[PDB]
RNA sequence: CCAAGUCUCUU
RNA sequence: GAGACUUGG
């Protein structure tokens, strides 16, 4: 393998490639599920059997 | 009383196996000396009476199972994380409409998870009792 | 892929996996830096296996 | 531990003189019961390359060992050999000279 | 509502830091200085308290080495934990922990341990 | 009783 | 961990 190492080469390269600021959004997780999900379930298992 | 902090953390009070093994050894020795399973049962029950009485009115199922089967807990368990030789697991559970998170630690994944579930159960009981 | 200037990079993660995925991300940073150094500091006269 | 001690001393001196600053590259390695390589107490380090491979690769030019490299370990022909502690054994003398 | 990477990693390491501290009762790398320079902790310590402790250690108004020991401790705003250590010695072998952010722990026999810490601080304050 | 290194093998 | 081996003290 070969690659750029010189700082002049480094800064020449960042002209084209960028270090994007990267953040991390999270979300509250909930497990409560609605009845209709149970209904659709039951239907699909009936169909599977 | 445990101090106040930010993260509800817990670990496993390690139980040495030597204690249980030696108790079994004494039972075996008592039997062999007496050669009387009647006398052996007498001593065993004399030892076990409090726990036999207590367990009948409440059977302790596996702690993780207890937490899962609870009606109003609804536990959620994070993935394990390793830092050096400590393994971490965090439990997210709900009590009285307020969602409470507790953290457990252990030498490996299973122990950390069990400690987290145990701590959740302790907090849940403290809210129950 | 966020190659543009001042590009923004956003991660959607459930709360209960927040710590784990932070661990994984910083592991990735460590690995990347390790590749960079292993290529930079390394010197070889044969330059061919 | 004399290896690591004197290695640190050479590091200080190398970053103490102008004429030797950019010519000498001290590196030290010992046998089993491998003494810690760092002076930081951070449980893990980011540098991975090994000392013997460095010297073989020319990255390091100044080697601080203790009767480890004298036997077996292949190394490129070396310009100078300094036996800081007195010679004791004939066979070791022969091998260090070699 | 924006959620950056660095802070969450700081908290990630913070959690384990707290766990280590609790389980091992301190002794973690809590102090920020480099290990080789960490020794200078006690004089990077507040200069006002430093000169107060110099005056206290150079004082001779104390009836007992005990008196002077914990008077110096108070001047330094620290509360060492003193505990005994099992030993074969007829004289009880004592141990003291300074409880400060730098895990410094000593032992010495009851008679000299107070003199031992006195000398330790005659050295350390410098 | 002390060092060094080695080796099998423990963290 | 156990040690083992060589060399020397």
Curated annotation (Swiss-Prot), chain B:
Task: Give expression by tissue.
Answer: In ovary (at protein level).
Give the subcellular location. Nucleus; Cytoplasm; Cytoplasm, Cytoplasmic ribonucleoprotein granule
Knockout consequences: Abolishes RNA-induced silencing complex (RISC) assembly and RNAi silencing activity. Abolishes siRNA unwinding prior to loading onto the RNA-induced silencing complex (RISC). Decreased levels of endo-siRNAs. Increased susceptibility to infection with RNA viruses such as Flock House virus, Drosophila C virus or Sindbis virus. No effect on the processing of pre-miRNAs. RNAi-mediated knockdown inhibits the induction of the antifungal peptide Drs in response to M.luteus challenge. Also highly susceptible to infection with A.fumigatus, with 80% of flies dying six days after infection.
According to the UniProt record, where is the region Essential for efficient and high-fidelity siRNA production and siRNA loading?
60-129
**Protein purpose:** Double-stranded RNA (dsRNA) endoribonuclease which cleaves endogenous (endo), exogenous (exo), and viral dsRNAs to produce short interfering RNAs (siRNAs). The generated siRNAs then mediate gene silencing, also called RNA interference (RNAi), by controlling the elimination of endogenous transcripts from mobile and repetitive DNA elements of the genome as well as exogenous RNA of viral origin. Also acts in an RNAi-independent manner to activate translation through cytoplasmic polyadenylation.
Q: What is known of its domains?
A: When in complex with loqs isoform PD (loqs-PD), undergoes significant conformational changes during the full ATP-dependent dicing reaction cycle for processing a 50 bp dsRNA with a 3' two-nucleotide overhang and a 5' monophosphate terminus. At the initial dsRNA binding stage, the helicase and DUF283 domains transition from an extended to a closed conformation, this anchors the bound dsRNA through major and minor groove recognition and forms the ATP- and 5'-phosphate binding pockets required for dicing activity. The N-terminal helicase domain, containing the Helicase ATP-binding, Helicase C-terminal and Helicase insertion domains, functions in dsRNA stimulated ATPase activity and RNA translocation during the dicing reaction. Essential for processing endogenous and viral dsRNAs. Binds and hydrolyzes ATP enabling the dicer to translocate along the long dsRNA substrates, and produce siRNAs processively from the end. Some reports suggest the domain is essential for the recognition and initial binding of both blunt (BLT) and 3' overhanging (3'ovr) termini dsRNA substrates.
Please identify the protein, giving its name as recorded. Answer: Endoribonuclease Dcr-2
What is the organism field in this record? Drosophila melanogaster (Fruit fly)
Q: What is the lineage of its organism?
A: Eukaryota, Metazoa, Ecdysozoa, Arthropoda, Hexapoda
Q: Which gene encodes it?
A: Dcr-2
Could you say which residues of the full protein are shown?
1594 to 1722 of 1722
